[PDB]
Amino acid sequence: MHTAEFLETEPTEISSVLAGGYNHPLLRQWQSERQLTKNMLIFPLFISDNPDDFTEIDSAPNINRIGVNRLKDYLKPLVAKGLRSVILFGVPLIPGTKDPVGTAADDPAGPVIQGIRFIREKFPELYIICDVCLCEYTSHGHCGVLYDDGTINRERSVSRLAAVAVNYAKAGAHCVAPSDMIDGRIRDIKRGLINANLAHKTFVLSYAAKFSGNLYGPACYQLPPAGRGLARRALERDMSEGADGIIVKPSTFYLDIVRDASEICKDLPICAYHVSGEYAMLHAAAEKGVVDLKTIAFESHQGFLRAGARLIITYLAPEFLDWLDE
């Protein structure tokens, strides 16, 4: 009858023995290239035209569309818990603001520039980052100024984006993150900051590698998912043009790209961006009990760190600010 067979083997080779390196819970921390701190997280903020706003957005999120009047009660618990940075997204709702040139982009009385002025007065501890694009301010909804019924007009889009970027910095934003993906915008935004004498105090956080996908919502310059060479050339371009830091978006599905950015842009801080759709997919899976949210969030976020990122833009900051306390 069937009996357990045991082949004979040679003595163990030391080169085969890796196990003494990870056997204790502590050795598991010892084994990581970098550990998750609270000053690494960056919380996205969606500021509304309506100063009293605080409207729930939806997918699987727990994120809102707040207004300058509710902004102080929302950032207080966060700041006290250790939050050190936020990235600003303006959401102009008033019936007659959006246009073909994204005019409302640097509107001194828009959500963003008013979000900046409020934060720097009530939370001078917070590092202000601002997303730079025209998608949310143009009537068409594209990332830049279009040509008559066609493609994006590179020259006008960039020239426009440089202005918005310099205006946020002039209003007090410590950092501008351009997310248009339009060729050469980093150079013009950097040159514009230089001419505006704000280059030495505004960190240009480039979304160097922003891919298109089904991670933004079920269903303009944007790398195709298989585009690794373009992503690498875009990383290198953006650093040569002046970027002081780089962003990879999405992150979990593009970990190899963050690893590439970690070698191409070795001397610059890399940032991973946990996209709404990834966040909303972790939440869903969680509720369907396919996985445990806290468990899948630490795994996913340690992945950014392991892949090479030292900064993470995520909608899970509120939570993490809790969990890292533990």
* Contact flag: residue 290 with a second copy (CB under 8 A): yes
Which one of 63, 129, 143, 313 is in contact with Zn ion (CB under 5 A)?
143
* Among 1-9, 132-140, 256-264, 317-325, the segment contacting Zn ion (CB under 5 A): 132-140
Among 132, 143, 223, 316, binds a second copy (CB under 8 A): 223
Q: How far is CA 57 from CA 41, 47, 260, 276, in A?
A: 21, 12, 33, 11
State how beta strands 54-56 and 64-66 pair: antiparallel
Pairing of strands 127-132, 175-178: parallel
Q: Which is nearer to Zn ion, 68 or 182 (CB)?
A: 182
Q: Which helix (H) or strand (E) holds 175?
A: strand 175-178
Site string for Zn ion, 207-236 (x = CB under 5 A): -------------x----------------
Torsion angle defined by CA atoms of residues 182, 183, 189 and 192, in that order, rounded to the nearest 10 degrees: -130
Give the whole-angstrom CA distance, residue 284 versus residue 293: 9
Interface with a second copy by CB under 8 A: which range of 31-39, 69-77, 82-90, 313-321? 31-39
Q: Alpha-carbon distance 88 to 112, whole Å? A: 6
Known catalytic membership, residue 249: yes
Asked about 72 being catalytic, the answer comes back as no
Does the annotation place 135 within a ligand binding site?
yes
Cα–Cα distances (Å) from 214 to 176, 180, 218, 225, in that order, read: 26, 18, 6, 11
Residue choice 129, 143, 208, 307 for contact with a second copy (CB under 8 A): 307
Q: Which stretch binds Zn ion (CB under 5 A): 75-83, 135-143, 161-169, 290-298?
A: 135-143
Nearer to Zn ion, 102 or 308 (CB): 102
Single out the residue of 258, 313, 316, 317 in contact with a second copy (rule: CB under 8 A).
258
88 within 8 A of 116, measured Cβ to Cβ: yes
Choosing from 71, 104, 133, 231, the residue that interacts with Zn ion (CB under 5 A) is 133
Distance CA 155, CA 173 (A): 25
Piece in contact with a second copy (CB under 8 A), picked from 41-49, 67-75, 124-132, 235-243: 235-243
Nearest to 269 by CA among 323, 212, 208, 184: 208
Q: Give every CB contact of residue 15 below 8 A, 6+ residues apart in sequence.
A: none
271 in a labelled binding site: no
Q: From the candidates 76, 249, 266, 294, give the one annotated as an active-site residue.
A: 249
Distance CA 218, CA 254 (A): 18
| 32 has binding-site annotation | no
Nearest residue (CB) to a second copy, 44 versus 277: 277
For residue 148, which phi and psi values (nearest 5 degrees)?
Answer: -55, 105
User: Is residue 5 within the footprint of a second copy (CB under 8 A)?
Assistant: yes
Q: Which does 57 bind (CB under 5 to 8 A by kind): a second copy, Zn ion, none?
A: none
143 is in an annotated binding site: yes
216 assigned ligand-binding residue? no
Residue set of the binding site: 133, 135, 143, 276, 315
Q: Which residues in this chain contact Zn ion in the complex, by CB under 5 A?
A: 133, 135, 142-143, 220
- List, by residue number, the catalytic residues: 210, 249
